[PDB]
Design a protein around this ligand. Structure first.
Ligand code: NA
Ligand SMILES: [Zn+2]
Ligand SMILES: [Zn+2]
Ligand SMILES: [Zn+2]
Lengths: 421, 420, 425, 422
C-alpha cells in the first residue's frame, strides 16, 4: 500500500483540524439505553425491527445540527451509517431495513447531513460496522449477538459482498467523504484467524474505498496494529500511550492519530445518563489530545425526537467560546517537542511552541528542551512577556501569578524549526 | 350512596359480559420496558417528556384494534387515559402534555377508539391514575416518584381540581363510558391518613362521575375494602379469594368482581417479554374467573409503532374460536353453587349448572351438591347424555372418555333455581 | 433385561427390592465448603483459586461432630439409609484416600476419617450407607479438557484424562474395600461435558469399566448416576433431582421413567451444602407429604441435610426429622414395604400397595367423597387406617366411591382397602 | 479538660517517629472469608453466626511467625482487633463466654500470645476495640447497622457501657504495656441528633479510664470528624490527611498525630475472592506519601481461618522491608516536609535536613517552591553523590544526571536553618 498524494494531503488536513464530533444515531435511540441494547438484552431481531415503523425524529434539522457542531470549533463529523444492529441510516438498495423504506420518517438523514456539511464547510466521515446482529449471513457468529434469535444461516461471502455494495453506495451518492471508520472486527477475536485481514476481507474493502475516493481516509477500531491500507489509527477512550479505559495498549503507529470519547458516558442516547463532562474537562481533553499529536473525536448521542441533547449543545457552544481565542494554539499544530506531563502539554507549529499549563499551582515551570535558542516567551492571550532562563539542560519559565484555568498558554518562539519526532 | 337503577342495570350487564381487554398504552411504549420505567429508573420528568415529540404510532388503526378484540368474545375495553407518568392519551385542555399537543402524531387516540367501540358494539372503560410522577402539585409525595427530579412544590388542592377537570372531559366528550377505573391511591399508604377517602377527594370524585353518567361504574384498584360509591371490586393478578401474586388478601365484597391480569408478564409493552400465555391457559383463566363469579380483564400492551402485538392478536383470535362454541356457558352466568375445585369450576344461570372440567383424568366426577333434584345431564357441545347417580351426599357423573382439553363442559338441568 | 449386556446378580436384585421397601433415606452434603457456608458450588460460583480454597482445609475442625448422634437423629425419622458425599466437585476427599493428600485425614487438623466413623455407626444402628462420588473435579489438572464449569478456578497446567479415570477407579476401589458393605454408589457431574457432542457417552466417562469394577468388588452394591437422562446399562437405580418421576417443576428432569428402582432427591431447606443465609426449612407437613407423594409414584425420597462447619446437623433439621419419625411410628406400614399403587397420583393424593392391600393417602381434599378409578378386583373392606373405623363405599364396573363422615384430616388421611385378589404391579 | 501526661506526649512523638504499623483484622468472620462486615451485610442471625465459633481452629497460627513477618517490613507497631462489630472477643475476657478461649476448640488467647511475642521482638501492640455490637441485646436502641441480625430482646445502654469499661480494664491490665486503644463504630448512631456526642458514647469515662490505667497509652477513635478531647491521635480512613478520594474523610486536619489506614488488598478481613494485593511499588509510595503529609501509615493484613497471614502479604511486607533497609532514615524519625505534596512526589524533614522523595518524574531537573532558608548542599541519598542546584528568591532548581529511578529517587538537602513545622 502506498497512499496517493491526495490521501497524504488529506492526512495533513485531518491532523490540522484536530477536533471532530462523533454522532451515534439509530433506532436504538428510541429505547434510549445505548447502542448495544439489542445484544445486551438479547432482543429478538424481528421484534427489534418492529421499532422502525414507529421511528419518527420529527425535530431533526440537519442545518441546526451542523451549525451547533461548527460553533464548537470542530471541523468534521463522524456519523453512524450502520451500527451493530444492522439498521442502515441511508437509502441503501442492499436491504429494505433502512431509514427511508422501513420508517414513517422516510428521509435519508445521511443525505441531508452531507448537504449541510458541504454548505457549512464541515467534512463528513462515515462510521460503518463490520459486525451485524441481524443478518443471517454474518456466519459463523463471534462472541456477541448469540441471543438475538437468528435461526437461519447464510454465507460469509454474501455478507462480504453486502458490505462491499454498501460501501460503494456510501462513496457514490453522498459527495466527497473524508473517512470511513470501521468497527466490530474484534467480535471474532475468539477464533485463531478471527483478526486477520483475510477473514474480514480488508484488502478488497480498502482497495475499493481508495479506488472510489483516493482522498478518503480509512480507520478501523480494532485496537491493534493498523493494517496496511489504513490511514488513521484509532484509540478508544484513551489518549495514545494510555490505557485507563482498558480498550487500548497497542503501539502508537506512524499514522495520524485520533482518540474517541463520549461527552456523557455512552455513545448512543441513554436516558438515564445525563452526566455530561464539564466544559473545563472537555477543553482540557482536546488540549491533551493535541499535545499527544492526536485528534479528539467527541461524541453526542441524538435523542429519539431528533434533537441533539441541549446540554451537549451548550458544552459545544462553550468549547467554541474558548476556541475563538485559542484555536491557533491547537488547530494547525502537532504534538510538541516536550511530551505530555502532569502539569500539561505542548503543541508546535513551525518555530512556535505553545506551552499549555493545565494543572500547576506553582509559579515556575521547567521544560526539558535544549539545542534550540529561545528568542521570546509571552502569555498567548495578554501578550505579556514571560521571564525565563535557558541553558544546556533546559528552560525555566517564571510566572507572575498562579496559572489560570482551564489552560494557561505561553507562546515560545525559537530560532530554529521545532523538530517533528 | 345508593346506586341509581341505571347503575344496577349496568352492574348486571357487566357481570353477564364476563370478559374485557385491558390496554396500557403511552409514551412509555417507546422505551418498551414497562409502564413504571419513569419511576423504576428515576428518569428526570423533563428528559422523559422529550420523548413525546418523537412519538408517532404510524400503524395505529382503531378499527383494527377493536375488531381484533371483538373477535375474542370480549365485550369491553379498558384503556389508560393517563397513567402514573402523567401523560394524557386524549385531547385534554388541562395540560399541554398530551397525545394531541405534545407529539407529532397529533391525534386523539381515545376519541378514535370510542368511535370504533360504539360502531362495533364494544363498551369503553377508562383507566385514570390518581398517582402522578410529573406534576409538582402532587405534593406531599408518597412512596414512589421520589427520583423523577421535581424541585418545585404545588398544592394538593390544585391537583385534585386537575383530576376533577379531566374526569369531566372524559365523561362529557367521549360518549357513554362504561366505567372509570382508578389506580394509584396506594402510593400514600405510608402515611396514617394516606388511604382515606378524604385524602384522595374520592367522595367529590365519585359524585361527579355519577352525576355526569349515572350508569358509569366506578372501580378503584386500592386492594382493600371498596369505598362507598364504588360499583365494582378489583382483584389484581388473582382470582377473588386467592393471593398467589401478593397484591390481594382483601375480603370479597358484594360488588361485581373483576380480576385483571397480563397476557405476557407486563402491562405496558416490554420488548424483552415475549412470553405470552398459551391459548389453553388463557381460556382456563377466563373459565376459572367465571367460576368464582368474576370478570376477567386480560391485558395487551401496544407497541410504539401503534400495532397490537401479533402474538396477542393470535391468542385473542383463538380464544374467540373457543367462545364461538362455549360462550353461553360463561357469558350470562354467575359463579356456580359448587365452588372451585382442583378439577375445575361451575357456573350457573337459572336452573342450569355448567360443569367446567379443566383438569381431570378420571371418567367420573363427584359433585358435592344436594337438595335440588337433577333432571338431566348432557355434554354441552355434543349434546349426548351423561349417566349420573344422585343421593343425599351429592352427585356422581360418569363419562364415556377421559375429559378433553381445554374445558370439558357438562350441562346439568335442575328442578329448582340454583341459589346464589 | 432393562439393560442389555448387563445382568444384575441375584444379590443385586435382592438389594433393589430392599431399597424400594425402605422408601426413605437422608442425603448428607458435607465438605470444607461448609466453612464458607454458601453452598457446595461456591468454588465454581465465585471462581475461587484452587490453591487458595485448599488453604481452608488446614483450618477445618468440626469439633462437635459425633457420628453416633448423626446416625441416631436420622434413624429416628424412620429413614433406613444415608447417602454421604465422599468427594464433591471441589475435589476434596472426606475419607482416608491414598490417591491424594487433599483429604480430611492428611490435610486438616481434624485428622479423622469421618466416613469410617459413620460407616461403623451405621452398621451398629442398622442403617445402610450409600456413597456419593463426583465425576466432576474443579481442582485436578487431569480433569482435561474442561467442560462447562470450573473454568475460573485458576488451573494453569493440564494432565491426561486417562490418569483422571485411573484416579477415580482407585478411589472407588478404596471406598468399596475399607468401609464394609456399601449399599450404593451415587455418581454425579457427568452433565459437565454435555457441551460436547460425545460428552454424555459411556465411553467418555469410562462408565463400563467403573460399573464393572463396583459390581466385582460388591455385587449387591447399587449404582445410580445423576445424569438426568436414560439410565446407562449397569445402573441399578434411576435418580430424579428435585422432582417426582414424571414431573419437571424444577427443570432438571424430563427424562423417561425407566424400569429401575426410582429415587427422588430434594433439599430440606433450599441448598445441598450448609448455607448460613438459608434457614427456611420446609414444614414437617410438607416433608411428610413429599415422602408420601414419592411412595405413591413408586419412588424413594432422599431428603438432604447440610452439616455445619462445627460438625453438627442443623438443629431445625433434626427437629423436622424427629417429627417425621413421630408420624412414621404410626404410618410406616402404609409406605415402607409398599410400591406405587394401581391408582396413580392425583390432585387429592396418591395410593400405595402391598399384597391385596391398597393404602389411599388423601393429602388434599375437603369434600367427603372420593372416586377411585379401579375395577376388576372385588373390594372386601375399607377402614380408616389409624382408627380402624369402617368407611362406606360403593363399587361397580366403573370404579369405587368412598364416603367419609368428616372432612379429611392432615397431613395424610389414610384409608386401608382390602381386595379379594392381589393388586397388579 | 484534657491535658496529656508527659509520658503521653513522649509516646506521641515516638508514634510519629515510627511512621509505619500493620493492622490485623482477625475473627471468626475469617472462616466465612467474605469480609468482617458479613454478619450485617448478609443479615446473619446472631445465634446461627455464633455456631461458627465451635468450628474455629486456626491450627497454623504462630505468633512468633506473625510478629517476625511484620518486623521484617520496617513496621514498628501492630494494631489488632480485640473485638470487632460481630461482638466476638479475641482474648480471654471474663465479661462474656463469646470469646476465643471459651467458645472455640482452639482454646487459646491469641492476644496474649501476640503480646508476649511483640514484647520479645520489640514491636509495640495497639488494640482495636469496637463501640458497635451486632450481637448484644443491650446495644439498644439500634443505630443504622445490625437491624437484620435477629435480636428479639432489649437490654439497657448503661449495661452495655459498663460491659465496655470492664473489657477495656482487662485489656489494659492483663496484657502488658499497650501503645494505643483504637476505637471504631460510633458513626453507627449518626442517624440520631445526639448520636455522635461524647455523652451518648460515654467517651469521657472511657478515655479517663484508659489514661488512668496506662497514661502513655494513646487513644484514637475512627469517627471521621473533629477529634474529641482525650484523643491522642487522629485517624484518616483510606485517605491521606486532606484527601477524600475514598469518601470516608473530609474532616479538618487536627494538631494531633495523624494516621492513615488502608488495606493491602481491598478488604480488612480475609476475603477469599480478593487476591488483588497492591504492588510493592504502590505500597512503598503509599508509605512515602503518608510521611510527606506528616502521617503514619497503618497497612492492613487479614489473616486466614487456618491462622496464617496471606503469603502474598508476607512477601509484600518483606519487599517493603528490603526498601526500608536502605531508606528508613528518610521516613522514620521525620515529619512532613516544608514543601507539601506535589504531582512529582513529597518531602519529609528532620532538623535542617529536607528529604526530597521523587516518586513520579521523567525530567532531569526539579523546581522546589521554597525560599528564605539558604541551601548549603544537595546529594543523592543512597549514592551520596552531589546534585547541582540553583537557588534564588523564587525557589530552588535541582539538576540530575539521569532520569529519576523507581520507586523513590531521594535527594538529601541540608539547609542553614532549621526547617519549620507549619
Ligand atoms: Na371433591
Ligand atoms: Zn442533495
Ligand atoms: Zn472400623
Ligand atoms: Zn505469656
Amino acid at each position: 500500500y502506498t497512499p496517493s498524494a491526495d490521501n497524504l494531503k488529506a492526512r495533513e488536513t485531518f491532523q490540522d483540524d484536530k477536533f471532530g464530533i462523533f454522532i451515534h444515531w439509530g433506532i436504538y435511540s428510541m429505547l434510549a439505553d445505548g447502542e448495544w441494547v439489542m445484544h445486551n438484552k438479547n432482543l429478538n431481531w424481528e421484534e427489534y425491527a418492529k421499532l422502525a415503523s414507529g421511528f419518527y425524529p420529527a425535530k431533526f434539522n440537519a442545518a441546526e445540527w451542523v451549525a451547533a457542531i461548527k460553533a464548537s470549533g470542530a471541523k468534521y463529523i463522524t456519523i453512524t451509517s450502520r451500527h451493530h444492529d444492522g439498521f442502515s441510516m441511508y437509502a441503501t438498495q442492499q436491504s429494505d431495513y433502512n431509514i427511508v423504506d422501513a420508517t414513517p420518517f422516510k428521509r435519508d438523514v445521511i443525505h441531508e447531513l452531507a448537504d449541510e456539511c458541504r454548505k457549512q464547510g464541515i467534512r463528513l466521515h462515515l462510521y460503518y460496522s463490520h459486525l451485524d446482529w441481524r443478518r443471517d449471513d454474518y456466519y459463523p457468529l463471534g462472541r456477541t449477538g448469540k441471543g438475538t434469535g437468528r435461526t437461519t444461516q447464510g454465507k460469509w461471502e454474501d455478507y462480504c459482498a453486502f458490505m462491499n455494495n454498501q460501501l460503494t453506495e456510501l462513496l457514490t451518492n453522498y459527495g466527497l467523504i473524508g473517512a470511513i471508520w470501521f468497527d466490530g472486527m474484534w467480535d471474532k477475536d475468539i477464533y485463531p484467524d478471527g483478526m486477520t485481514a483475510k477473514t474480514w476481507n480488508l484488502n478488497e474493502q480498502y482497495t475499493l474505498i481508495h479506488r472510489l475516493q483516493p482522498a478518503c481516509l480509512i480507520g478501523n477500531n480494532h485496537h491493534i496494529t493498523p493494517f496496511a491500507g489504513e490511514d488513521i489509527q484509532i484509540f478508544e477512550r484513551d489518549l495514545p500511550g494510555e490505557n485507563k479505559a482498558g480498550l487500548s495498549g497497542q503501539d502508537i503507529s506512524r499514522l495520524p492519530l485520533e482518540t474517541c470519547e463520549t461527552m456523557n458516558g455512552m455513545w448512543g442516547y441513554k436516558i438515564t445518563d445525563q452526566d455530561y463532562k464539564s466544559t473545563k474537562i472537555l477543553i482540557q481533553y482536546l488540549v491533551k489530545a493535541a499535545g499527544k499529536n492526536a485528534n479528539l473525536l467527541m461524541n453526542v448521542g441524538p435523542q429519539p425526537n431528533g434533537e441533539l441533547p441541549t446540554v451537549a449543545v451548550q458544552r459545544l457552544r462553550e468549547m467554541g467560546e474558548w476556541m475563538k481565542i485559542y484555536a491557533p494554539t491547537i488547530q494547525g499544530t502537532r504534538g510538541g517537542v516536550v511530551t505530555p506531563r502532569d502539569w500539561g502539554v505542548t503543541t508546535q507549529k513551525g518555530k512556535t511552541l505553545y506551552v499549555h499549563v493545565l494543572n500547576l499551582d506553582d509559579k515556575a515551570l521547567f521544560l526539558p528542551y535544549a539545542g534550540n535558542k529561545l528568542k521570546s516567551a509571552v502569555e498567548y492571550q495578554s501578550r505579556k512577556s514571560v521571564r525565563f532562563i535557558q541553558d544546556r539542560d533546559g528552560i525555566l519559565l517564571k510566572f507572575t501569578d498562579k496559572p489560570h484555568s482551564p489552560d494557561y498558554v505561553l507562546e515560545l518562539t525559537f530560532a530554529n524549526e521545532l523538530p517533528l519526532n
